[PDB]
Amino acid sequence: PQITLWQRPVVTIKIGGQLMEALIDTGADDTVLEEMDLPGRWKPKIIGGIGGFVKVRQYDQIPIEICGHKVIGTVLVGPTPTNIIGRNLLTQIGCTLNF
C-alpha cells in the first residue's frame, strides 16, 4: 500500500499466535517489542534511544507475520511504550520510502 505520514504509521504484526499493533520506524535499526515472554533463550543488550539507554532481551530467529507476509529476524524485548519495528524486518517485506 501507500501509507501517509499524517498519523503514526502503525500496522499489525503477529508474534507467536498473538496479534498486536506496531510502528513502522525507519530511524530504528532494530525491532523493539513490548513485554512478553517469547519461546527461546535470551541474551542481554543495552540499546540507546532519545531519552536514555534501555536494557533489552535479544531473541534470535523469531517468526513474524507482518500483514500476512511471514518473515524472520531478531527482536529485542524491553520496557518500551510502543512496539516498534525497525529496518531489520522492514527490508524483509520490501518497504521503501518515496517522495
Ligand X SMILES: CC(C)(C)NC(=O)[C@@H]1CN(Cc2cccnc2)CCN1C[C@@H](O)C[C@@H](Cc1ccccc1)C(=O)N[C@H]1c2ccccc2C[C@H]1O
Tell me which residues touch ligand X (CB under 6 A): 25, 27-30, 32, 47-50, 80-82, 84, 86
Task: Calculate Rg over the CA atoms of the chain.
Answer: 13
Q: Which three cell numbers stand for residue 22?
A: 506496531
Q: Which of 20, 21, 26, 63 binds a copy of itself (CB under 8 A)?
A: 26
How, if at all, do strands 43-49 and 52-66 pair? antiparallel
Instruction: Tell me how far apart the alpha carbons of residues 58 and 60 are, in angstroms, rounded to a whole number.
Output: 7
Q: Smallest gap, in angstroms, from Cβ of residue 80 to ligand X?
A: 4
Site size with a copy of itself, rule: CB under 8 A:
39
CB of 21 closer than 8 Å to CB of 66: no
What positions carry a catalytic annotation? 25
Residues in touch with a copy of itself (CB under 8 A): 1-6, 8-9, 23-29, 32, 47-54, 67, 69, 80-81, 84, 87, 90-91, 93-99
